Write a protein that binds this DNA or RNA. Sequence first.
RNA 1: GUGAACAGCCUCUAGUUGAUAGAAUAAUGUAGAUAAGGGAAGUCGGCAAAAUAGAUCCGUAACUUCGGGAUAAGGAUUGGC
RNA 2: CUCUUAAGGUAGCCAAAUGCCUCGUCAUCUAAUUAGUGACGCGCAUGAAUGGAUUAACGAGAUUCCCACUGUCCCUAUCUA
RNA 3: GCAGUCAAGCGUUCAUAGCGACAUUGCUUUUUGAUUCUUCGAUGUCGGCUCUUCCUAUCAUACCGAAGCAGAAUUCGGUAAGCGUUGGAUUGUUCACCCACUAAUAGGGAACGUGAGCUGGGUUUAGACCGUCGUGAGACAGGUUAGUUUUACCCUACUGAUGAAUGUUACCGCAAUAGUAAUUGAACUUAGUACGAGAGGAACAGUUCAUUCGGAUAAUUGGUUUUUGCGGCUGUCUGAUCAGGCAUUGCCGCGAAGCUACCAUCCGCUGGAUUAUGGCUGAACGCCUCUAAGUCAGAAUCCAUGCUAGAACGCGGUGAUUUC
Lengths: 52, 386, 136
Amino acid sequence: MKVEIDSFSGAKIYPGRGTLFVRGDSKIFRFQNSKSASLFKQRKNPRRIAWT
Amino acid sequence: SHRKYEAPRHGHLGFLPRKRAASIRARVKAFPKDDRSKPVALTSFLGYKAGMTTIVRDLDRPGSKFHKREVVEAVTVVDTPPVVVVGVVGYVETPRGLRSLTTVWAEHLSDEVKRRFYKNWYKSKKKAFTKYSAKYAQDGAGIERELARIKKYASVVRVLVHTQIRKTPLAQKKAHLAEIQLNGGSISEKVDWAREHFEKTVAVDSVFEQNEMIDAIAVTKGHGFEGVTHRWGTKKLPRKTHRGLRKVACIGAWHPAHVMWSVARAGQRGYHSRTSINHKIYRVGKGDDEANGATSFDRTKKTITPMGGFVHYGEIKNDFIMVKGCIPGNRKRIVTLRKSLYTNTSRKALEEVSLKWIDTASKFGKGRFQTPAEKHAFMGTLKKDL
Amino acid sequence: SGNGAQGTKFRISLGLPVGAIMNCADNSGARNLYIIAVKGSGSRLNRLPAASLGDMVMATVKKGKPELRKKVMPAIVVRQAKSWRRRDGVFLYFEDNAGVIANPKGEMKGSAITGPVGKECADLWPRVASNSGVVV
RNA sequence: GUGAACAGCCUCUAGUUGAUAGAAUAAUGUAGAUAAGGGAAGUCGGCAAAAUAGAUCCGUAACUUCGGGAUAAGGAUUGGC
RNA sequence: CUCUUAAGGUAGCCAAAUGCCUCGUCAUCUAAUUAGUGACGCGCAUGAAUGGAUUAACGAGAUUCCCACUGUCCCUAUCUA
RNA sequence: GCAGUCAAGCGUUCAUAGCGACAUUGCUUUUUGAUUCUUCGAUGUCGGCUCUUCCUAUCAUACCGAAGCAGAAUUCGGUAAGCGUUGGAUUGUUCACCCACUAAUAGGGAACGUGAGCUGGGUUUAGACCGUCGUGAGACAGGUUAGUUUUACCCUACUGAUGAAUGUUACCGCAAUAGUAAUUGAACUUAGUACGAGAGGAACAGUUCAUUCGGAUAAUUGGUUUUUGCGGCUGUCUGAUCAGGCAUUGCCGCGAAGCUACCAUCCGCUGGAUUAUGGCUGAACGCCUCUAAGUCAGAAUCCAUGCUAGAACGCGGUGAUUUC
Ligand SMILES: NC[C@@H]1O[C@H](O[C@H]2[C@@H](O)[C@H](O[C@@H]3[C@@H](O)[C@H](N)C[C@H](N)[C@H]3O[C@H]3O[C@H](CO)[C@@H](O)[C@H](O)[C@H]3N)O[C@@H]2CO)[C@H](N)[C@@H](O)[C@@H]1O
Ligand SMILES: NC[C@@H]1O[C@H](O[C@H]2[C@@H](O)[C@H](O[C@@H]3[C@@H](O)[C@H](N)C[C@H](N)[C@H]3O[C@H]3O[C@H](CO)[C@@H](O)[C@H](O)[C@H]3N)O[C@@H]2CO)[C@H](N)[C@@H](O)[C@@H]1O
Ligand SMILES: NC[C@@H]1O[C@H](O[C@H]2[C@@H](O)[C@H](O[C@@H]3[C@@H](O)[C@H](N)C[C@H](N)[C@H]3O[C@H]3O[C@H](CO)[C@@H](O)[C@H](O)[C@H]3N)O[C@@H]2CO)[C@H](N)[C@@H](O)[C@@H]1O
Ligand SMILES: NC[C@@H]1O[C@H](O[C@H]2[C@@H](O)[C@H](O[C@@H]3[C@@H](O)[C@H](N)C[C@H](N)[C@H]3O[C@H]3O[C@H](CO)[C@@H](O)[C@H](O)[C@H]3N)O[C@@H]2CO)[C@H](N)[C@@H](O)[C@@H]1O
Ligand SMILES: NC[C@@H]1O[C@H](O[C@H]2[C@@H](O)[C@H](O[C@@H]3[C@@H](O)[C@H](N)C[C@H](N)[C@H]3O[C@H]3O[C@H](CO)[C@@H](O)[C@H](O)[C@H]3N)O[C@@H]2CO)[C@H](N)[C@@H](O)[C@@H]1O
Ligand SMILES: [Mg+2]
Ligand SMILES: [Mg+2]
Ligand SMILES: [Mg+2]
Ligand SMILES: [Mg+2]
Ligand SMILES: [Mg+2]
Ligand SMILES: [Mg+2]
Ligand SMILES: [Mg+2]
Ligand SMILES: [Mg+2]
Ligand SMILES: [Mg+2]
Ligand SMILES: [Mg+2]
Ligand SMILES: [Mg+2]
Ligand SMILES: [Mg+2]
Ligand SMILES: [Mg+2]
Ligand SMILES: [Mg+2]
Ligand SMILES: [Mg+2]
Ligand SMILES: [Mg+2]
Ligand SMILES: [Mg+2]
Ligand SMILES: [Mg+2]
Ligand SMILES: [Mg+2]
Ligand SMILES: [Mg+2]
Ligand SMILES: [Mg+2]
Ligand SMILES: [Mg+2]
Ligand SMILES: [Mg+2]
Ligand SMILES: [Mg+2]
Ligand SMILES: [Mg+2]
Ligand SMILES: [Mg+2]
Ligand SMILES: [Mg+2]
Ligand SMILES: [Mg+2]
Ligand SMILES: [Mg+2]
Ligand SMILES: [Mg+2]
Ligand SMILES: [Mg+2]
Ligand SMILES: [Mg+2]
Ligand SMILES: [Mg+2]
Ligand SMILES: [Mg+2]
Ligand SMILES: [Mg+2]
Ligand SMILES: [Mg+2]
Ligand SMILES: [Mg+2]
Ligand SMILES: [Mg+2]
Ligand SMILES: [Mg+2]
Ligand SMILES: [Mg+2]
Ligand SMILES: [Mg+2]
Ligand SMILES: [Mg+2]
Ligand SMILES: [Mg+2]
Ligand SMILES: [Mg+2]
Ligand SMILES: [Mg+2]
Ligand SMILES: [Mg+2]
Ligand SMILES: [Mg+2]
Ligand SMILES: [Mg+2]
Ligand SMILES: [Mg+2]
Ligand SMILES: [Mg+2]
Ligand SMILES: [Mg+2]
Ligand SMILES: [Mg+2]
Ligand SMILES: [Mg+2]
Ligand SMILES: [Mg+2]
Ligand SMILES: [Mg+2]
Ligand SMILES: [Mg+2]
Ligand SMILES: [Mg+2]
Ligand SMILES: [Mg+2]
Ligand SMILES: [Mg+2]
Ligand SMILES: [Mg+2]
Ligand SMILES: [Mg+2]
Ligand SMILES: [Mg+2]
Ligand SMILES: [Mg+2]
Ligand SMILES: [Mg+2]
Ligand SMILES: [Mg+2]
Ligand SMILES: [Mg+2]
Ligand SMILES: [Mg+2]
Ligand SMILES: [Mg+2]
Ligand SMILES: [Mg+2]
Ligand SMILES: [Mg+2]
Ligand SMILES: [Mg+2]
Ligand SMILES: [Mg+2]
Ligand SMILES: [Mg+2]
Ligand SMILES: [Mg+2]
Ligand SMILES: [Mg+2]
Ligand SMILES: [Mg+2]
Ligand SMILES: [Mg+2]
Ligand SMILES: [Mg+2]
Ligand SMILES: [Mg+2]
Ligand SMILES: [Mg+2]
Ligand SMILES: [Mg+2]
Ligand SMILES: [Mg+2]
Ligand SMILES: [Mg+2]
Ligand SMILES: [Mg+2]
Ligand SMILES: [Mg+2]
Ligand SMILES: [Mg+2]
Ligand SMILES: [Mg+2]
Ligand SMILES: [Mg+2]
Ligand SMILES: [Mg+2]
Ligand SMILES: [Mg+2]
Ligand SMILES: [Mg+2]
Ligand SMILES: [Mg+2]
Ligand SMILES: [Mg+2]
Ligand SMILES: [Mg+2]
Ligand SMILES: [Mg+2]
Ligand SMILES: [Mg+2]
Ligand SMILES: [Mg+2]
Ligand SMILES: [Mg+2]
Ligand SMILES: [Mg+2]
Ligand SMILES: [Mg+2]
Ligand SMILES: [Mg+2]
Ligand SMILES: [Mg+2]
Ligand SMILES: [Mg+2]
Ligand SMILES: [Mg+2]
Ligand SMILES: [Mg+2]
Ligand SMILES: [Mg+2]
Ligand SMILES: [Mg+2]
Ligand SMILES: [Mg+2]
Ligand SMILES: [Mg+2]
Ligand SMILES: [Mg+2]
Ligand SMILES: [Mg+2]
Ligand SMILES: [Mg+2]
Ligand SMILES: [Mg+2]
Ligand SMILES: [Mg+2]
Ligand SMILES: [Mg+2]
Ligand SMILES: [Mg+2]
Ligand SMILES: [Mg+2]
Ligand SMILES: [Mg+2]
Ligand SMILES: [Mg+2]
Ligand SMILES: [Mg+2]
Ligand SMILES: [Mg+2]
Ligand SMILES: [Mg+2]
Ligand SMILES: [Mg+2]
Ligand SMILES: [Mg+2]
Ligand SMILES: [Mg+2]
Ligand SMILES: [Mg+2]
Ligand SMILES: [Mg+2]
Ligand SMILES: [Mg+2]
Ligand SMILES: [Mg+2]
Ligand SMILES: [Mg+2]
Ligand SMILES: [Mg+2]
Ligand SMILES: [Mg+2]
Ligand SMILES: [Mg+2]
Ligand SMILES: [Mg+2]
Ligand SMILES: [Mg+2]
Ligand SMILES: [Mg+2]
Ligand SMILES: [Mg+2]
Ligand SMILES: [Mg+2]
Ligand SMILES: [Mg+2]
Ligand SMILES: [Mg+2]
Ligand SMILES: [Mg+2]
Ligand SMILES: [Mg+2]
Ligand SMILES: [Mg+2]
Ligand SMILES: [Mg+2]
Ligand SMILES: [Mg+2]
Ligand SMILES: [Mg+2]
Ligand SMILES: [Mg+2]
Ligand SMILES: [Mg+2]
Ligand SMILES: [Mg+2]
Ligand SMILES: [Mg+2]
């Protein structure tokens, strides 16, 4: 089994937990929690979010 | 006048009446069919629901899309320290039913059991079994006579056993006492196995093994008094309706002139007893072992207990049954694992599982880490721990 | 699902009830696909029959070539916006809802499918799997 | 004070602090909220609810009793220093 | 040409808030429309200040559709007084 | 409305596979009449929504018999009401009609079930328009528009909740009686096989899923936020700061925990006996015959198993049983 990584934060995503978004251009995004994903959806900038 | 359109009714009339159970330990109303050609063992066991975690394993289901592929699965862990045998009960068949002939108790009873016989223990003088223990002190006889009285007569034999709840994280000091049927051979060998195990202790591994199908007997979590909508699953009424929409519109036809046993009504929901069957053992946990949450594939040394412990429970310091899926009743509740009533081949039933990985991350919120070790790696070093 | 299926389809959450309008992802010249029925569906009083990805719906075209509109045709859901969960345990979802025009067999009216497609839809309909770009 | 403003929101003076009270927090209510995906498929009917909203710039159709229609429609902007 | 009783429906309008038959027929809108709109008119029983036709603007009037919007619904869940 | 009997005739041949004229015997009371017994010091009047239960004259599904059954399809029939019987366009509608899915979209009852359950579109007061009628006031089963839907705290019933008393108290148990539950589909394979000239085109066994239903459950994902937990923003107030108050939770973002979702996951048992039916042996009747005696098999059925409650006037085993 394969630990993936949050496309926003950089947190380790174990099996199960988190969501997987597939953008219309087919680029894949993985989020470890509804927080990260929301930030992404808010169009926030992971370079400016301190805990990322 | 013949309802406009048909739909099946709401709720299963076989689970009536829906009331609060007559006790928090749910009853084992059936035991596996005895095959007396085998060694004498217990047909069930006592434990406490700790909580749940997840699991990753490869599926053996040839012909399925996911055959030879990795799946995740929910699992409940049952905290199941061993049990100690305090007694034996003979049961005799009668034209009016099964009847209890005698009961014989071990000479010394753990204070956890004695606690169960008392409503107010602290101020009681704890007269316990005190006069009953004289039956041993007299060399023999009165215990032996009844012990043989069981052999001479009883068709069924059961051991009274009780949980060691001090080993268990709960605050409750009152242990749980239960009858378990003895499914090995030969009522004599049964009662012999019984008294040889007086004051002795029996462990989960003696009863269940990996991949075994088992049934869970538990009192479902109580919700109290409930409206018809969520108790019976009725459709909600429209918004426009006077005097509330969470009701049932027509509770009865004009005739019969009584509202009927079969109609949905508000009242108690949950705290019902449930016998839930066909749950596969994904793990027989090992009390002393520190690999409790480990795997051949994932070799990191860790226990089954997550980070921050099992929420609202504690840590698993004893042997644990980790069974697939979910189980009736809630965390901390005494539960009864009972081995299956019927021989089930299925396919799903006979598959052997071996886990690749067990989730130890915290259930107190969304955990990013498995061991506190793994955390220090990712996190680095904080202002704390200077 | 539909008929002409290759293999099974495990259950996945239903995002596309009747009345839903999904994007048309093929080159047939259709833009809208407005779902009037779901082929595989069972029945319960007042339940809207709802399609997931890989299901074969029946639809009409509300935006597209006039030759293609004002009539009922099959369609297959390539992408769904509501999250479902695969047996491996990831919850995933697409950025829009999309479908492709098919025929009862599943042979597509389109010669190409623009945009991604979930493996579920592909594994179930080879003719879709043929015409499609990146999958999942 | 904020603001176009006797708006709404906060305040000085002045007047009040009066509307049986204690404990809980089931069901159903009355009133107030939020909902994944779909988006009127609900219903006699979009009933209810939701969406719109100030100001600046831009752009603004048919029709017309030439006065209108018009805030039509459609867009962009908006803090702080 | 006739006919009872003075005349014998003109300009217009129409399945119209007036049409029985009737869910009239044709076209349009819809996957499907006793709905809507445009037509047609021997119009049971439209029709000229008993006012006829038209009509910009106005309307807590009646009606249909579209976009937006939404717990109206799929299908229900949770929160506060 | 539903069904018998006779069998002229239909069905190439051929009464009866499937049908059926002339007649004739019936059942039914979800049709309409006929009647006027009940109710006029009042039984809320259409439809819908919701929910339960019953009927069977069976639409599907289980097991079958018949065919003008090669296969495939269909049709007739038996045991069957166990289980299910849907989603929309127009209409107030019941009804109707169409679109669509479906195993199938069967028909009915319960004061034409159900208004102190809703709703109030329709009908059926009082306002108003039109058409037709009338000198007029006004009328119409004609079209149209607007038009207050009250009360339960009693008894019973139902749902769930306590409980005196049967020495006391406590623990483990029994099980009378009652309730009961799972339904249905598809794919692969069998097999391009059987059968057929062909066109076509099955099934049992095996495998994977699914559907409606039901019971739980919260690891996960999602929902919810007075954790008013952290942050952010507006206005005003506290001289400034820091830290805060007020705007009926001021507003926004995230938000654990709990609750919760086919929007989440898990689980949903085993026998015995029968029905129709097909048979064994086998008389009546030296033959024949499933039947008379006897007996074999056999269904989504029955009785259990399993599951729920536990009789508060059903019961068993057991522990301890009082000193200011
Ligand atoms: N359709 C479901 C049921 O099908 C029954 O009959 C169906 C069957 O006889 C037939 O279906 C067959 C099936 O028997 C058989 N075991 C598998 C086959 N794939 C199916 O028929 C097939 O026809 C074509 C050509 O082969 C395929 O391409 C298509 O995928 C499939 N529909 O198609 C009929 C129509 O669907 C009954 N009509 C009825 O119970 C119900 O309609
Ligand atoms: N006009 C906006 C102003 O700001 C606020 O209004 C904003 C929000 O309150 C409102 O939020 C609504 C929510 O109330 C409603 N119940 C649901 C809706 N999805 C939300 O809105 C938003 O939803 C998502 C993003 O979350 C977007 O897809 C959507 O386009 C967006 N309008 O969206 C509004 C902007 O469109 C206040 N209501 C008021 O001050 C005023 O209306
Ligand atoms: N659809 C694929 C396969 O084809 C099958 O084929 C069946 C169908 O082709 C046809 O069944 C018809 C059906 O079309 C129609 N819609 C209903 C009808 N009662 C059925 O009839 C059939 O089945 C019933 C019930 O099982 C029997 O009682 C009857 O004797 C039989 N002729 O006859 C076959 C059964 O005798 C089934 N549809 C299905 O179960 C199977 O998987
Ligand atoms: N699962 C496959 C499909 O679903 C069903 O398949 C079921 C059958 O194959 C079989 O079910 C049998 C059924 O055949 C038979 N005719 C009735 C029986 N009750 C059913 O059995 C079921 O209920 C009994 C208790 O009654 C339980 O003991 C048993 O474990 C349970 N599977 O087991 C399957 C699951 O229960 C349908 N028959 C059919 O649509 C198709 O085979
Ligand atoms: N057959 C026993 C085993 O359990 C399963 O079988 C279960 C069912 O599929 C099987 O169904 C049989 C049916 O095949 C057989 N031809 C008739 C029998 N009465 C049915 O069984 C079921 O029938 C009805 C269902 O409501 C019940 O009354 C009955 O008690 C129940 N056993 O009955 C079994 C339960 O006893 C599987 N076949 C398999 O696991 C294994 O063979
Ligand atoms: Mg969350
Ligand atoms: Mg019915
Ligand atoms: Mg009715
Ligand atoms: Mg029913
Ligand atoms: Mg019992
Ligand atoms: Mg039992
Ligand atoms: Mg001893
Ligand atoms: Mg302890
Ligand atoms: Mg300890
Ligand atoms: Mg503790
Ligand atoms: Mg063992
Ligand atoms: Mg509670
Ligand atoms: Mg509630
Ligand atoms: Mg429900
Ligand atoms: Mg009201
Ligand atoms: Mg209800
Ligand atoms: Mg065995
Ligand atoms: Mg948690
Ligand atoms: Mg800290
Ligand atoms: Mg395109
Ligand atoms: Mg093109
Ligand atoms: Mg193009
Ligand atoms: Mg289906
Ligand atoms: Mg359907
Ligand atoms: Mg409805
Ligand atoms: Mg290509
Ligand atoms: Mg490709
Ligand atoms: Mg100013
Ligand atoms: Mg002011
Ligand atoms: Mg008062
Ligand atoms: Mg109070
Ligand atoms: Mg409430
Ligand atoms: Mg309210
Ligand atoms: Mg919010
Ligand atoms: Mg929504
Ligand atoms: Mg949304
Ligand atoms: Mg939209
Ligand atoms: Mg609507
Ligand atoms: Mg509608
Ligand atoms: Mg309507
Ligand atoms: Mg409104
Ligand atoms: Mg709101
Ligand atoms: Mg200008
Ligand atoms: Mg001009
Ligand atoms: Mg504008
Ligand atoms: Mg205009
Ligand atoms: Mg600036
Ligand atoms: Mg004329
Ligand atoms: Mg005239
Ligand atoms: Mg003239
Ligand atoms: Mg003139
Ligand atoms: Mg006309
Ligand atoms: Mg009209
Ligand atoms: Mg006009
Ligand atoms: Mg009209
Ligand atoms: Mg309409
Ligand atoms: Mg029309
Ligand atoms: Mg018209
Ligand atoms: Mg005319
Ligand atoms: Mg004319
Ligand atoms: Mg006429
Ligand atoms: Mg006139
Ligand atoms: Mg006049
Ligand atoms: Mg005049
Ligand atoms: Mg006139
Ligand atoms: Mg005029
Ligand atoms: Mg206007
Ligand atoms: Mg208006
Ligand atoms: Mg208007
Ligand atoms: Mg208006
Ligand atoms: Mg809302
Ligand atoms: Mg009849
Ligand atoms: Mg002839
Ligand atoms: Mg013949
Ligand atoms: Mg009649
Ligand atoms: Mg009378
Ligand atoms: Mg009368
Ligand atoms: Mg009276
Ligand atoms: Mg009267
Ligand atoms: Mg009265
Ligand atoms: Mg009454
Ligand atoms: Mg009244
Ligand atoms: Mg009436
Ligand atoms: Mg019958
Ligand atoms: Mg039949
Ligand atoms: Mg039919
Ligand atoms: Mg012949
Ligand atoms: Mg045929
Ligand atoms: Mg057919
Ligand atoms: Mg017939
Ligand atoms: Mg029934
Ligand atoms: Mg219908
Ligand atoms: Mg409707
Ligand atoms: Mg309608
Ligand atoms: Mg017809
Ligand atoms: Mg019908
Ligand atoms: Mg019919
Ligand atoms: Mg009456
Ligand atoms: Mg009647
Ligand atoms: Mg009635
Ligand atoms: Mg009543
Ligand atoms: Mg009323
Ligand atoms: Mg009524
Ligand atoms: Mg009314
Ligand atoms: Mg009324
Ligand atoms: Mg009336
Ligand atoms: Mg009136
Ligand atoms: Mg007149
Ligand atoms: Mg009216
Ligand atoms: Mg009206
Ligand atoms: Mg009014
Ligand atoms: Mg009215
Ligand atoms: Mg009133
Ligand atoms: Mg009331
Ligand atoms: Mg009263
Ligand atoms: Mg007690
Ligand atoms: Mg007990
Ligand atoms: Mg083949
Ligand atoms: Mg072929
Ligand atoms: Mg051949
Ligand atoms: Mg031939
Ligand atoms: Mg051949
Ligand atoms: Mg088969
Ligand atoms: Mg099989
Ligand atoms: Mg539930
Ligand atoms: Mg909040
Ligand atoms: Mg200060
Ligand atoms: Mg402030
Ligand atoms: Mg203040
Ligand atoms: Mg406010
Ligand atoms: Mg105020
Ligand atoms: Mg505050
Ligand atoms: Mg949130
Ligand atoms: Mg949560
Ligand atoms: Mg099952
Ligand atoms: Mg299942
Ligand atoms: Mg069971
Ligand atoms: Mg069993
Ligand atoms: Mg048998
Ligand atoms: Mg014979
Ligand atoms: Mg026989
Ligand atoms: Mg006999
Ligand atoms: Mg005889
Ligand atoms: Mg037999
Ligand atoms: Mg059954
Ligand atoms: Mg008991
Ligand atoms: Mg008792
Ligand atoms: Mg009794
Ligand atoms: Mg007595
Ligand atoms: Mg005695």
